[PDB]
C-alpha cells in the first residue's frame, strides 16, 4: 500500500514549487497537489494514540484508492479518527481479516478487497 | 627576601625567580641599571612555586635575564588626588604631558571590588551632554553606565568629548581614558580640551597603540580608580567639593584586544572569538565600580561612558554584547546616518537608556516625550514616504514634522548647548512654532534663535534654568515669556 | 509594470546578497578561529 | 588543619596541609588575612601529598605565598529558616544588609547537597497566570516547574523578569528566593529592593517574604559560581517544610561562565569555546536541586544570557534540556520595538497541553504558531519578490501574522521609566479570547499599527474607534 | 657575547650564552657563515639560563648546532643619511643594488626606535597638498597621517607613487622612502627600478630622490616583518632634519602576514582567523612612528590587500584603525583612459571636514560626490530605457557628472615623456575653485572633451577658446 503513498508524497513535495507561486496550473496538477495535501494531513497523528498495523493499512488503502478525495483537508484527520471508530464498532471482522492475512504476497485479495471498500463506502454514506 | 632575579623574559612576561613575600598583585619595580635610567614596573600575577610570573608594564626588551627586581609591597595602585587634575598621565600615574611631576597625597589600588548592591541608590541627577538628541531621547544621569557603540569613524569620540566639554559648570571631574588610541588622536583630543578650557576639570589617562599590551589593560582601571577617589573623597573644583565624576573609557574593544593579547601570550585557553574566557569579568569589574552611592556612603557618583567599535554595524559580536549587557543604556551611532549628513548620528529607534529617564530635568522630559512620539511617527511613516501625492494631509504633515525634528537634532561638533537652550528650542519646535520654517535652514535658525536668547532675553534663559526642577515646567509665566520670545524672534527674522 | 517589479526584485536580491556575504564572512572567520583554537589545544 | 599557601594563580589557591589532615573535596578553608576578616576558599581538587586546589571566592589579590590556611572541616554552611526571610546574603551566607548578623541558634546547612532522588520528583504541574500575553499564550509559565528566558544582550530580560516579579510576587501564597548571580547591582538589585520593599501584601511587604542572595558581576568567579548553590540551599529548607517557593535565578549563564573561569584557572583541559570540561555535570548539580518534590513545590523562573547572539553556545544548549518552559528572546524582534521580544516559534512549554491548559487555549496557541510559521516560510519571497506574488490566502495569513507579531507586544508597569505607555495586565482568558478573535477575522480591517503596545483585543478596538 | 647555537628548527633558532652578557630582546645576533657573509638573527625571546630564541632572517640551511654566535648589543643597525638616497637596501641595511658598500663613516641607527612622545605630536591636523586634483579634493591627504590605496596594480598605482614623489621633491624638501614589504623580485623590484630611473623631474630622476628598502618574497618571515621598521628607521633621519617625507609601503597586509608567520613559528597561541596575538601591538609599533611632529612629518601611503573581500577581517581592521584616508583605484575608471583612476565614491578621508580643509572645500567635495552618486544610481536606468526617460536637471547631473569624472584626469610630470603632455600641479585652493565653478554652471556649454587630462578650469576654458 505505501508505495503509492511515498510516490505521491515525493511528487507533491516536487510540485510545492508551483504550489507556492503558480495559480494557473492545470486541473491535473491541482488534483495532484490536493492528493498530496490529503496524504500529508493523513499523517498528522496525535500523541499517545498509536494505530495498529491493520488500522494504518485500512486508512492508507482508503486514501490511496481515491475514497478520500471528496473530504476537505481540515477534516481528514477527524475523518480518519471517525473511520476507525466505525471499524471498531460496525465491523471488527474487517480489521481481523486485514490483520490475519497481512503477510500474503498479494495483499489486495478479492476477499480483502471486498468488505473493506464496502466498509469505506458504508462509512461515506453514514458520515456526510 | 624582598628582592628577586629575572630568570626568563618572554612574551611580555618575566618569571622573577625568588621573590618571596610578594602579594598576588604587587607592582614590582625592576630598579634601574646601566642603560635604563628610569624604572619600569610589573604586575606579579602567577605566584606559583619558586617562580613569580609578572606582566611587564612597558617594553619588554628593556630588561634582561638576571635583572634585579624589588618588591614595592603595594598592590598595583595609581596615584590619585587633586594633583591629577589637568594632567595627561600614563596608566601607571606617571605624567606624559611634560608639565611636571604629579603631586599626590595618596595612591588608590586599582582592581578593587565594586561598592556593592546595598551601597547604591537610583540615579536622580541628570548629566547634560549638550547634544539635543542625547539629552532628549537618551537621558543620562550621574552614576549610570551608558555605552557609546558605533562603527569606526562615526563620532563616538566626538560625542564623548562634547559631553566632557559641556560639564564645565556642572561640577564634574571628567576622566578620559584613551585605550589603544594612536598618539595623534590623543594629542588632538588633549588640544581640543585645552582650547575650550575643559582641562581644568579633566584627567586624561593615555595608553596608546604603540605601548605594551600590559598598558591598555590597566589604563581603564587606573582611570576608574581616579573616578572612585572623586566619587568617595571628592576634590575641590571652582571652590566647591565635587564628588561626581564622569569617565569615558573610549574604545573598550581595543582594551579587550589588549587583554586578549596578554592572555594568549600567557598561554591561557582561548574562548569565543579567541578572547579569554574572563573578558566579560574584565569589563564587568571595570564598569561595575561606576556607581551612584547612597547618602550614607557619601552620595557621590561616577558616570561611565564606554565606547565600543563594531565592524559593519554588527552589534551581535562578543565584546559589544558583553558591554551592552554590562551597561545600563546604549547609544547606537549608525554609519548610514553619519554619511547622510546627520552628524550626531543616533539610531533613536533602537537606542535606549534603561535608567536615567527619571534622572532627567522635568522640563527636558516634558518637552521631549512628545518629541519622541513624533520621531516614532516619522520612523513609522518612513515606509510611506516613498509615495508621492498618495498621502493625505496627516501623513504628509507628520513626515514634514519628523524631517524638521531630525534637522533640528543635527548639531555641529564642539558646540554644546545649555539645558535651558535645549528645552526652549524643543518647546518651540514641538509646539508647532516651526512649521512655517523651511527644513534646510532650521539648524541655522536654531543658532540664530540661541543668539537671540543670548542677547535679547537673558532673563528668559535664566527663568527657564531656575524653573527646570518644578513638577510642571510649563508654568504660565515661563510659557508666556517663552512664547513671546519665539513670536518676537520670528517677526524680526 | 513587469520591468519595474523586476528592477525592485533585483535591487532586493542585491541587498540580500550583501547581507548574506556579511554573514558568510562572519561564519568564515568564526570557522577559522575555531579550527586554529582546536588545533592549538590539540598541540598543547 | 593549619596548611600553608604554595601558589596563588588567579582566584585559585593551592595549599599544602599535613599528610593526615588533608581537607575533603568540598570543604571550606580560610585565610586569616589579618584585619580580623578572613578569606573563605572552597576546595575543588586534591593533587597529592596534602596539596589541595581551592577557589578563593574573594579578592585574593593582596595575599602572599606561605600564608597559613585553616581547615574548617565542613563545606560552606549558610543560614536557613525564617531568620533568612527578608534579608540579603552573600555567597557565604553572611548578610550584607544593614541589619545584624544571623544568630548562632539559626540552623546552618551546607551549600552542597544531593538533589532530590527519583522517588521525590513531583511531575504534577498547572498553568501559572503571569499577565503577559506571549508568555501566557505561547509558552505558559509553569507552576511547580522549571522555566527560563534565553535572551541576548540588548533584549529585555531584566524588564521581563521585573514585570514577572511585580505581577506574581504579591499573590505568592508562600515565600520567595531571588539569586543575583552575575547581574548588574544597579538594576538587577538595589532597585528590585526598591520595588519589592514598596509592594505591600496586607501590611507585609513582598521583601518580607523574600530571601535574596546576590554575588553579582563585581564579585570574583567563586562567588558567582557558588551563589546559586547558596540560594538553592536557602530555598530547599522552605520547600522541605511545605511552603511554596517562587525562585528567581538571574543569568544562570553567568553561573556557567564563572565555572569556566574557575576551570581555566584550575588547569583543566578546555572544552568547546574555552568552557569547562565539567559543564554538563555542574549544570546538572545546580539544576536538579531546582525541583518541586512531594513535600513542597518550587516555581522556578530563570534567565539565561546567550553570548553574542549564539543560541548554539554550550551554556544555553545545556540549559535547554533542564526546563519545562522555554521563552526565547530575539534581538531582531527587539530591534522592531517589540519590547517583549519573545519569538513564538522558538518558545515552547510542556504544559501547553489541552488537558492541562484547556482545549481552546491549546487550539489558539497552535494556530498562532501555524500562522507565523507560514510567515517564516514566506520571509524571503516577501523580501525579494514582494507581497503581490503570494496567493490570496497566503496574503491573508501574512497580514494576520504581522498583526499577531505587533499584538504580542505589551507595555509593562516596570517600563514606565523609559516608555510612556502605562502598564497592562492581560489575563490568560483575555489573551486567548483576543487571539481567537484575531484569527477568526475580526480586526482584519484594523491597521497593524493599532496592535502595537496594547492589552486585549478590546483595547485595540477602542483605539481604532478613537482613530475612527 | 660569543654564544653557541643550541637549536635550529627551521628559521627559529636558539643560542646559548654565558650567564652574563645575554642579549636583550630584538638584539640582532650574528652568525658567521664561514666567509665574509653572515646571518643576522633577531632575538625574540629569552629562555632559562642564557638561551635566547631568535628568528633567522636568512637561509639557515648551512648552519650546525654549536656554531659561534656574536651579540651586537643593539637592534638591527640600519645605515641612515643622504648616502641611502638613490640606493636599494634589504631589511638588514645591506645595499642589494650594483653599487658597493655604504661605508663605516655613515651613521647606523637601531631598527627598533620609539614613536615620538606625546609632547612632540602636533595638536592640529594639517592638510598635505599632493597636487593631484581628485586626491586633494575627494580624499585629501593628512600631513603625517597614514593613507591607504586599493588597487590591482594594473591601474597606474606606480604612476601615482612617482607623481607624489616628484611633487614633494620639487615643491617641498622632498625625500621619499619606498618599503617593498613582501615585494616580488621581478614585478616589484626590477620593474619599479626601471620606472623610477627612467622617470625624471627637473633633470633629476625619481630614483635619485627616494630610498628603496626591499623585503622580498624569498626572504624569511622575520625579514618581511622588519623591513617596514628598516624603512621607518631610514626615513626618521630625514624627518629629524625637519624635512617632510613620503613613505610608500606596498601591501601592508604582507607585513601582517609576516608577523603572523613569525608568531606561529615562535609557538605563540593563534588569535581569531590565523592572526598573531600581538596584532594590535605590532601594528602600533609600526604606523605610530608615522606622525607629524614639531620638527618634521612623515606621511605614508600604504597599499592594503584585503583578504578575500573582508573589510572586517582583523588585518584590514587593524590597518583601518590607523588610517586617515583611503584611495580606491578601480579597474573600470582606468579602462577608460583616466589614469588617476581614483574612485571618488569609494575613496574617503578623515580630514575632509569643514574645521580643517575649510567650509568651501567641504561644500564642493560633497556636491561633487552627490552628483556622482546620483549618476551611479542612474547608471542602471540609462541602460534600462536610455537617457531620454531621465528627467531634466537629472539629465544635467548625468551630463555634468560625466564631465566632472573626465575632469578628474590630470597630466603628470612623471608621465610627460610617455604621453608627451606636460604635468600640471593643481593646488588645493585652485582645485576647489575650479570644481565649484564647474558645478555652479560655468563650462556647461563646453562638451565632455577639453576637460580630459587638464589642469584648472582656466585650462579648460583657454582650450575651448583655442
Ligand atoms: N557632530 C559632528 N559634526 C561634524 N563633524 C563631526 C561630528 N562628529 C564627528 N565629526 C567628525 O567625524 C570624524 C570622526 O569622528 P571622531 O573623531 O569622533 O571618531 P569616532 O567615530 O569616535 O572614531 P575613530 O576614533 O575610530 O576615528 C572627525 O573628523 C570628526 O571631526
Ligand atoms: Mg573615535
Any CB–CB contact under 8 A between C2 and chain B? no
> What experimental approach yielded this model?
cryo-EM
Cα E168 to middle of ligand 1, angstroms: 29
Place of cell 583612476: E341
Binding residues of D for ATP: 151-158
The rounded distance, in Å, linking the Cα atoms of D431 and D442 is 15
Of E79, E63, E9, E7, the residue nearest E31 (C-alpha): E63
Residues 6+ apart with CB under 8 A from E453: E409, E410, E411, E419, E421
Give me the DSSP letters along B227-256. HHHHHHT-EEETTEEE-EEEEEEEEHHHHH
Which conformational region is residue E180 in: left (phi greater than 0), alpha (psi within -120 to 50 degrees), or beta? beta
Q: Give the Cα separation of E297 and E172 in Å (integer).
A: 12
- Distance separating the N- and C-terminal Cα atoms of chain C: 64
Looking at the DSSP bridge assignments, the partners of residue E200 are: E205
Alpha helices in chain A (DSSP H): 2-21, 27-42, 53-64, 73-89, 92-100, 110-113, 117-126
Cross-chain residue pair C32–E309, CB shorter than 8 Å: no
Q: Own/partner pairs for E274-278, CB < 8 Å, 24+ apart?
A: E274/C32, E274/C36, E275/E314, E275/E315, E277/B11, E277/B260, E277/B261, E277/B264, E277/B265, E278/B11, E278/B213, E278/B261, E278/B265
Annotated catalytic residue E74: no
How many angstroms separate the CA of residue D378 from the nearest CA in chain A? 9
Q: Which grid cell sits at E415? A: 608621465
At residue D383, φ and ψ (nearest 5 deg) are: -65, -40
Dihedral (Cα; D454, D456, D460, D463), 10-degree rounding: -70
C-alpha to C-alpha distance for E366 and E364, rounded to whole angstroms? 5
B402 Cβ contact list (under 8 Å, min separation 6): B374, B375, B377, B378, B379, B381
Helix (H, G, I), strand (E, B) or coil at D146: strand
d(C-alpha A92, C-alpha A110), whole Å: 18
- Cα A102 vs. chain centroid, distance in angstroms? 17
Nearest by Cα to D265 from B266, B16, B215 = B266
Catalytic positions of B: 354
β D174-179/D200-201 pair status: unpaired
- Which of D60, D26, D21 has the alpha carbon at shortest distance from D43? D26
B131 touches chain E (CB under 8 A): no
Give residues whose Cβ lies within 5 Å of ion ligand 2: B 156-157
Contact D273 C34 (CB under 8 A): yes
Between the CA of B279 and the centroid of ligand 1 the distance, in Å, is 28
Nearest residue to D130 via CA among D431, D452, D453: D431
C-alpha distances in angstroms, B460 versus B275, B363, B450, E32? 54, 14, 11, 85
SS3 E139: coil
**Greatest distance between any 2 Cα atoms in chain B:** 87
Lookup: cell for D254: 553567568
* A5 vs C38: CA distance, rounded Å: 47
What are the φ/ψ torsions at residue E56 (nearest 5 degrees)? -65, -50
> The cell 571595570 sits on which residue?
B286
Measured in whole angstroms, the distance separating CA B173 from the mean position of its chain's CA atoms is 12
Interchain contact, E125 vs B273, CB within 8 Å: no
Residue B125 · residue B133 · CB < 8 Å: no
Q: Helix or strand or coil: residue B374?
A: helix
Q: What SS3 class is residue B489? A: helix
Please spell the DSSP secondary structure of E63-96, one letter per residue: --TT-EEB--SSS-EEE-SGGGTT-EE-TTS-B-
Tell me the residues of D at the C interface, defined by beta carbons under 8 Å apart. 269-270, 273, 380, 383-386, 388
DSSP A60: H
**How many other CB atoms sit within 10 Å of the CB of residue D259?**
25
Instruction: Report CA torsion sign: B230, B233, B238, B240.
Output: positive
What is d(CA A18, CA A28) in angstroms, rounded to the nearest whole number? 13
E326 — contact with chain B (CB < 8 Å)? no
Which DSSP symbol is given to B8? Answer: -
Interatomic CA distance for residues D271 and E274, integer angstroms: 20
Exposed, middle or buried, E218 (CB in 10 Å: 0-12/13-18/19+)?
Answer: exposed
CA distance E207 to E191: 12
Helix segments in B57-213, DSSP class H: 132-137, 156-166, 183-195
- Residue D57's φ and ψ, nearest 5 degrees, are 55, 40
Q: Which residues of B touch C (CB under 8 A)?
A: 267, 269-270, 273-274, 312, 314
- Ligand nearest to the CA of residue B414, numbered in listed order: 1
The Cα–Cα gap between B366 and B470 comes to 11
Nearest to E82 by CA among E292, E241, E319: E241
Instruction: Let me know: does E329 contact E343? Beta carbons within 8 Å.
Output: yes
Alpha carbons B59 and B9: distance in angstroms, whole number? 11
**Ligand 1: which of B153, B310, B335, B336 to mutate, most ligand atoms within 8 Å of CB?**
B153
Is B227 annotated as ligand-binding?
no
E376 touches E163 (CB < 8 A): no
Whose atoms come closest to the Cα of B156: which ligand? 1
Task: Please answer whether residues B111 and B25 qualify as being in contact, where contact means their C-beta atoms are separated by less than 8 angstroms.
Answer: yes
Contacts of residue C29 in chain E, CB cutoff 8 Å? 272-273, 310, 312-314
User: In a 10 Å sphere around its CB, with 0-12 CB exposed, 13-18 middle and 19+ buried, how is residue B478 labelled?
Assistant: buried
The answer to whether the CB of B130 is under 6 A from ligand 1 is no
For residue E274, CA distances in Å to B109, C30, D263, D289, E258 come to 37, 11, 26, 43, 12
Instruction: Cite the DSSP H helix spans in B211-317.
Output: 219-232, 252-265, 279-287
> Which chain E residues are Cβ-neighbours of C32 within 8 angstroms?
272-274
Using alpha carbons only, what angle is made at residue E154 by residues E153 and E160, rounded to the nearest 5 degrees? 65
Is residue E113 exposed (0-12), middle (13-18) or buried (19+ Cβ within 10 Å)?
middle
Asked if E301 and E246 count as a contact pair (C-beta separation under 8 A), the reply is yes
The candidate with the shortest Cα–Cα distance to D146, out of D285, D289, D313, is: D289
Residue of B404, B405, B397 whose CA lies nearest to B381 = B397
- Report whether D41 contacts D30 (CB < 8 A): yes
E125's grid cell:
591636523
Number of alpha carbons in the 13 Å side-chain half-sphere of residue E29: 32
Are the beta carbons of E371 and E162 closer than 8 angstroms? Answer: no
B182 pocket-lining for ligand 1 (C-beta < 6 Å): no
Is there a contact between B201 and B243 (Cβ–Cβ < 8 Å)?
no
Q: How far apart are CA D276 and CA B272, in angstroms?
A: 13
| Contact criterion met (CB below 8 Å) for B120 and B144 | no
Cα separation of E171 and E193, whole Å?
23
Round to whole Å and give the CA distance between E159 and E284. 29
Nearest partner of E8 among E71, E50, E64, E69, judged by Cα: E64
**CB atoms near residue D448 (< 10 Å):** 15
E459 phi and psi angles, rounded to 5 deg? -65, -40
Q: Give CA–CA dist B125/B208, Å, rounded.
A: 33
Separation between Cα atoms, residue D112 and residue D75, nearest integer Å: 7
Going by C-alpha positions, the residue among E237, E260, E297, E275 that lies closest to residue E102 is E237
Residues near D152 by Cβ (< 8 Å), separated by ≥ 6?
A: B316, B321, D305, D306, D308, D309, D329, D330, D331, D334
Rounded distance, CA D336 to CA D214, Å?
33
Show the cell assigned to E260. Answer: 603572523
| Terminal alpha carbon distance of chain E | 76
Please give the residue of chain B at the shortest CA–CA distance from C18: B312
Q: Crossing angle for the helix pair B442-455 and B458-466, nearest 10 degrees?
A: 90
CA distance D248 to B287: 25
What is the Cα–Cα distance from D56 to D383, expressed in whole angstroms?
54
Does D61 contact B at CB distance below 8 Å? yes
Contacts of B293 (CB under 8 A, 6+ apart): B115, B119, B120, B121, B143, B231, B232, B299, B300, B301
Contact D120, D142 (CB under 8 A): no
Query: Element (H or E) spanning E81, and its range?
Result: none
Compute the Cα dihedral for B335, B337, B342, B346 and give only its sign: negative
Residue E433 CB: number of other CB atoms within 10 A?
16
Report which secondary-structure segment, H or E, holds E69.
strand E68-69
CB contact under 8 A, D61 and B75: yes
Distance from CA of B149 to the nearest CA of D (A): 12
Q: With CB atoms and an 8 Å threshold, state whether C9 touches D386.
A: yes
CA-to-CA distance for B238 and B249, rounded, in angstroms?
A: 25
**Which of C1, C2, C4, C5 has the most D C-beta neighbours within 10 Å, making it the best mutation to test the interface with D?**
C5
Mutate to test the interface with B, among E75, E232, E271, E308 (most CBs of B within 10 A): E271
Asked whether the beta carbons of A73 and A41 are under 8 A apart, the reply is yes
Are the Cβ atoms of E273 and C29 closer than 8 angstroms?
A: yes
Candidates E155, E166, E163; CA nearest to E133 is E163
Tell me the chain E residues in contact with residue C7 when contact means C-beta distances shorter than 8 Å. 380, 384
Tell me how crowded residue D345 is: count the other CB atoms within 10 A of its CB. Answer: 14
Atom number, ligand 1, closest to the C-alpha of residue E355: 31
**B interface mutation test: which of D418, D447, D467 has the most B CBs within 10 A?**
D418
Q: Min CA distance, B245 vs chain E (Å)?
A: 25
CA–CA distance, D410 with D412 (Å, rounded to integer):
6
CA distance A88 to A111: 20
E118/B210 touch (CB, cutoff 8 Å), yes or no? no
Cβ contact, residue pair B274, C37, below 8 Å = yes
CA distance E33 to B225: 55
Q: What is the DSSP letter of D270?
A: P
Position of cell 577617589? Answer: B229
C-alpha distance from E97 to closest chain B C-alpha (Å): 33
**Which atom of ligand 1 has the smallest separation from the CA of B410?**
1
Mutate to test the interface with C, among D385, D388, D389, D390 (most CBs of C within 10 A): D385
Which element (helix H / strand E) includes E12? strand E12-16
Cβ count within 10 A of residue E183 = 24
Taking a C-beta distance cutoff of 8 angstroms, is the pair D256, D285 a contact? no
d(CA B399, CA B410): 17
Residue in this structure with the C-alpha cell 601615482, named with its chain if needed: E160
What is the C-alpha to C-alpha distance for residues E427 and E405, in angstroms, rounded to an integer?
A: 18
Rounded Cα–Cα distance for residues D329 and D343 (Å): 6
* Whole-number Å distance between alpha carbons of B234 and B244: 8
Measured in angstroms, the CA of E310 and the nearest CA of chain C are apart by 7
Q: B66 with B6: CB under 8 angstroms? A: yes
Q: Do B254 and E280 touch (CB under 8 A)?
A: yes
Measure D436 CA to nearest chain A CA, in Å: 18
DSSP codes, D109-142: EES--PPP-STTB----EE---S-HHHHHTSPPE
Contact E88, E193 (CB under 8 A): yes
| B343 C-beta closer than 6 A to ligand 1 | yes
DSSP-derived 3-state class of residue B88: strand
User: Does E184 participate in catalysis according to the annotation?
Assistant: yes
The residue to mutate among E145, E324, E350, E365, having the most atoms of ligand 1 within 8 angstroms of its beta carbon, is: E350
Whether B contacts A, i.e. 3 or more CB pairs less than 8 A apart, is no
Alpha helix locations (H) across B37-155?
132-137
Q: How far is the CA of B380 from the centre of ligand 1 (A)?
A: 29
Residue contact D273–C8, C-beta within 8 A: no
Catalytic machinery residues of D: 157, 183-184
Please enumerate in sequence order all residues whose Cβ is within 8 A of that of A19, keeping only pairs 6 or more positions apart, or say none: A25, A33
Residue of B nearest to D338 (CA): B350
Give backbone dihedrals phi and psi of B289, rounded to 5 degrees, phi first.
-70, -15
Contacts of D283 (CB under 8 A, 6+ apart): D256, D318, D319, D322
Question: In which residue are the cell numbers 516634558 written?
Answer: B366
Is C43 at the interface with chain B, CB within 8 A? no
Asked whether the beta carbons of B187 and E118 are under 8 A apart, the reply is yes
Q: Which residues contact B231 (CB under 8 A, 6 or more apart)?
A: B243, B244, B245, B291, B293, B298, B300, B301, B302
Give the residues across from D46 on adjacent strands.
D52
User: Shortest CA distance to D184 belongs to which of D215, D206, D217?
Assistant: D217
Amino acid at each position: 500500500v505505501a508505495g503509492k503513498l511515498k510516490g505521491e508524497l515525493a511528487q507533491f513535495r516536487d510540485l510545492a514549487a508551483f504550489a507556492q507561486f503558480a495559480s494557473d496550473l492545470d486541473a491535473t496538477t491541482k488534483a495532484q497537489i490536493e492528493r498530496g495535501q490529503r496524504l500529508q494531513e493523513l499523517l498528522k497523528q496525535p500523541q499517545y494514540q498509536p494505530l495498529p498495523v491493520e488500522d494504518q493499512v485500512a486508512v492508507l488503502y482508503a486514501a490511496t484508492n481515491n475514497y478520500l478525495d471528496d473530504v476537505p483537508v481540515p477534516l481528514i484527520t477527524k475523518w480518519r479518527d471517525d473511520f476507525l471508530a466505525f471499524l471498531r464498532t460496525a465491523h471488527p471482522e474487517v480489521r481481523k481479516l486485514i490483520y490475519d492475512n497481512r503477510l500474503d504476497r498479494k495483499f489486495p485479495t478479492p476477499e480483502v478487497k471486498e468488505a473493506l471498500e464496502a466498509a469505506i463506502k458504508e462509512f461515506k454514506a453514514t458520515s456526510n | 627576601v624582598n628582592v628577586g632575579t629575572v630568570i626568563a623574559v618572554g612574551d611580555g612576561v618575566a618569571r622573577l625567580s625568588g621573590l618571596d613575600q610578594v602579594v598576588a598583585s604587587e607592582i614590582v619595580e625592576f630598579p634601574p641599571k646601566a642603560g635604563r635610567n628610569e624604572s619600569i614596573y610589573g604586575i606579579a600575577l602567577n605566584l606559583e612555586q619558586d617562580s613569580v610570573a609578572a606582566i611587564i608594564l612597558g617594553d619588554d626588551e628593556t630588561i634582561e635575564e638576571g635583572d634585579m627586581v624589588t618588591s614595592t609591597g603595594r598592590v598595583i595602585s595609581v596615584p590619585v588626588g587633586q594633583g591629577l587634575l589637568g594632567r595627561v598621565v600614563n596608566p601607571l600615574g606617571q605624567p606624559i604631558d611634560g608639565k611636571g611631576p604629579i603631586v599626590y597625597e595618596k595612591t588608590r589600588p586599582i582592581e578593587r571590588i565594586a561598592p556593592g548592591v546595598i551601597t547604591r541608590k537610583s540615579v536622580d541627577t541628570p548629566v547634560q551632554t549638550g547634544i539635543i538628541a542625547i539629552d532628549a531621547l537618551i537621558p543620562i544621569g550621574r552614576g549610570q553606565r551608558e555605552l557609546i557603540i558605533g562603527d569606526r569613524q562615526t563620532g563616538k569620540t566626538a560625542v564623548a568629548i562634547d559631553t566632557i566639554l559641556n560639564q564645565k559648570g556642572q561640577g564634574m571631574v571628567c576622566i578620559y581614558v584613551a585605550i589603544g588610541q594612536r598618539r595623534a588622536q590623543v594629542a588632538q583630543v588633549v588640544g581640543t580640551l585645552e582650547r575650550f578650557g575643559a582641562m581644568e576639570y579633566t584627567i586624561v589617562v593615555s595608553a596608546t597603540a604603540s605601548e605594551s599590551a600590559a598598558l591598555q589593560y590597566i589604563a581603564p582601571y587606573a582611570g576608574c580608580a581616579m573616578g572612585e577617589e572623586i566619587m568617595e573623597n571628592g576634590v575641590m573644583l571652582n571652590g566647591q567639593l565635587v564628588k561626581d565624576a564622569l569617565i569615558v573609557y573610549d574604545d573598550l574593544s581595543k582594551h579587550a584586544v589588549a587583554y586578549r593579547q596578554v592572555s594568549l601570550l600567557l598561554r591561557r585557553p582561548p574562548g569565543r572569538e579567541a578572547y579569554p574566557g574572563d573578558v566579560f569579568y574584565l569589563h564587568s569589574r571595570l564598569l561595575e565600580r561606576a556607581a551612584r552611592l547612597n547618602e550614607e556612603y557619601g552620595g557621590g557618583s561616577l558616570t561611565a561612558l564606554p565606547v565600543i567599535e563594531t565592524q559593519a554595524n554588527d552589534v551581535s559580536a562578543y565584546i559589544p554584547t558583553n558591554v551592552i549587557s554590562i551597561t545600563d543604556g546604549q547609544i547606537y551611532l549608525e554609519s548610514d546616518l553619519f554619511n547622510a549628513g546627520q552628524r550626531p548620528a543616533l539610531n533613536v529607534g533602537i537606542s535606549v537608556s534603561r535608567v536615567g529617564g527619571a534622572a532627567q530635568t522635568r522640563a527636558m522630559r516634558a518637552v521631549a516625550g512628545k518629541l519622541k512620539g513624533e520621531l516614532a511617527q516619522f520612523r513609522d511613516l518612513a515606509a510611506f514616504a516613498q509615495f508621492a501625492s498618495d498621502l493625505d494631509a496627516t501623513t504628509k504633515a507628520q513626515i514634514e514634522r519628523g524631517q524638521r525634528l531630525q534637522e533640528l537634532l543635527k548639531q555641529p561638533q564642539y558646540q554644546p548647548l545649555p539645558v535651558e537652550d535645549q528645552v526652549a528650542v524643543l518647546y518651540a519646535a514641538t509646539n508647532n512654532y516651526l512649521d512655517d520654517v523651511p527644513v534646510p535652514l532650521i539648524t541655522k535658525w536654531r543658532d540664530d534663535f540661541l543668539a537671540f536668547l543670548r542677547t535679547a532675553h537673558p532673563e528668559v534663559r535664566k527663568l527657564i534654568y531656575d524653573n527646570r526642577l518644578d513638577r510642571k515646567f510649563p508654568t504660565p509665566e515661563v510659557k508666556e515669556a517663552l512664547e513671546a520670545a519665539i513670536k518676537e524672534f520670528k517677526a524680526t527674522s | 509594470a513587469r520591468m519595474v517589479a523586476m528592477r525592485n526584485a533585483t535591487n532586493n536580491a542585491k541587498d540580500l546578497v550583501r547581507d548574506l556575504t556579511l554573514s558568510f564572512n562572519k561564519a568564515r572567520q568564526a570557522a577559522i578561529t575555531k579550527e586554529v583554537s582546536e588545533i592549538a589545544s590539540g598541540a598543547a | 588543619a593549619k596548611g600553608v599557601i604554595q601558589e596563588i594563580i588567579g582566584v585559585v589557591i593551592r595549599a599544602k596541609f599535613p599528610e593526615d589532615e588533608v581537607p575533603e573535596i568540598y570543604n571550606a578553608i580560610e585565610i586569616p588575612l589579618g584585619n580580623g576578616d578572613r578569606l573563605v576558599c572552597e576546595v575543588q581538587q586534591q593533587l597529592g601529598n596534602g596539596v589541595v586546589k581551592a577557589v578563593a571566592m574573594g579578592s585574593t589579590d593582596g595575599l602572599r605565598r606561605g600564608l597559613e590556611v585553616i581547615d574548617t572541616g565542613r563545606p560552606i554552611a549558610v543560614p536557613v529558616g525564617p531568620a533568612t526571610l527578608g534579608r540579603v546574603f552573600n555567597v557565604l551566607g553572611d548578610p550584607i544588609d544593614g541589619m545584624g548578623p544571623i544568630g548562632p541558634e539559626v540552623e546552618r546547612r551546607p551549600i552542597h547537597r544531593d538533589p532530590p532522588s527519583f522517588e521525590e520528583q513531583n511531575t504534577q504541574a498547572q498553568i501559572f497566570e503571569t499577565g503577559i500575553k506571549v508568555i501566557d499564550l505561547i509558552a505558559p509559565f509553569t507552576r511547580g516547574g522549571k522555566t527560563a528566558i534565553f535572551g541576548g544582550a540588548g533584549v529585555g530580560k531584566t524588564v521581563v523578569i521585573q514585570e514577572l516579579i511585580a505581577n506574581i510576587a504579591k499573590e505568592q501564597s508562600g515565600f520567595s528566593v531571588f539569586a543575583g548571580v552575575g547581574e548588574r547591582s544597579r538594576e538587577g538589585n538595589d532597585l528590585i529592593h526598591e520595588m519589592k520593599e514598596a509592594r505591600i501584601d496586607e501590611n507585609t511587604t513582598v521583601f518580607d517574604k523574600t530571601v535574596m542572595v546576590f554575588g553579582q558581576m563585581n564579585e570574583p568567579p567563586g562567588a558567582r559560581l557558588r551563589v546559586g548553590l547558596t540560594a538553592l540551599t536557602m530555598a530547599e529548607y522552605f520547600r522541605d517544610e511545605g511552603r511554596d517557593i517562587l525562585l528567581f535565578i538571574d543569568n544562570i549563564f553567568r553561573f556557567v561562565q564563572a565555572g569556566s573561569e574557575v576551570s581555566s584557572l584550575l588547569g583543566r583541559m578546555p572544552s568547546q569555546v574555552g568552557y569547562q570540561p565539567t559543564l554538563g555535570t555542574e549544570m546538572g548539580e545546580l539544576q536538579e536541586r531546582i525541583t518541586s518534590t512531594k513535600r513542597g513545590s518550587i516555581t522556578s523562573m530563570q534567565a539565561v544570557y546567550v553570548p553574542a547572539d549564539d543560541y548554539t553556545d554550550p551554556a544555553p544548549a545545556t540549559v535547554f534540556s533542564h526546563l519545562d518552559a522555554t521563552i526565547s528572546l530575539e534581538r531582531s524582534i527587539a530591534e522592531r520595538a517589540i519590547f517583549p521580544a519573545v519569538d513564538p516559534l522558538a518558545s515552547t512549554s510542556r504544559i501547553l497541553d489541552p488537558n492541562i491548559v484547556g482545549e481552546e487555549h491549546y487550539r489558539v496557541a497552535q494556530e498562532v504558531k501555524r500562522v507565523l510559521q507560514r510567515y517564516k516560510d514566506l520571509k524571503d519571497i516577501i523580501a525579494i519578490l514582494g507581497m503581490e506574488e503570494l496567493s490570496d490566502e497566503d496574503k491573508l495569513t501574512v497580514q494576520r501574522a504581522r498583526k499577531i507579531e505587533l499584538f504580542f507586544s505589551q507595555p509593562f508597569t516596570v517600563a514606565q521609566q523609559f516608555t510612556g505607555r502605562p502598564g497592562k495586565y492581560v489575563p490568560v482568558k483575555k489573551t486567548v479570547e483576543s487571539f481567537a478573535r484575531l484569527l477568526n477575522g475580526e480586526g482584519d480591517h484594523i491597521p497593524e499599527s493599532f496592535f502595537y503596545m496594547q492589552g486585549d483585543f478590546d483595547d485595540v478596538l477602542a483605539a481604532y474607534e478613537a482613530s475612527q
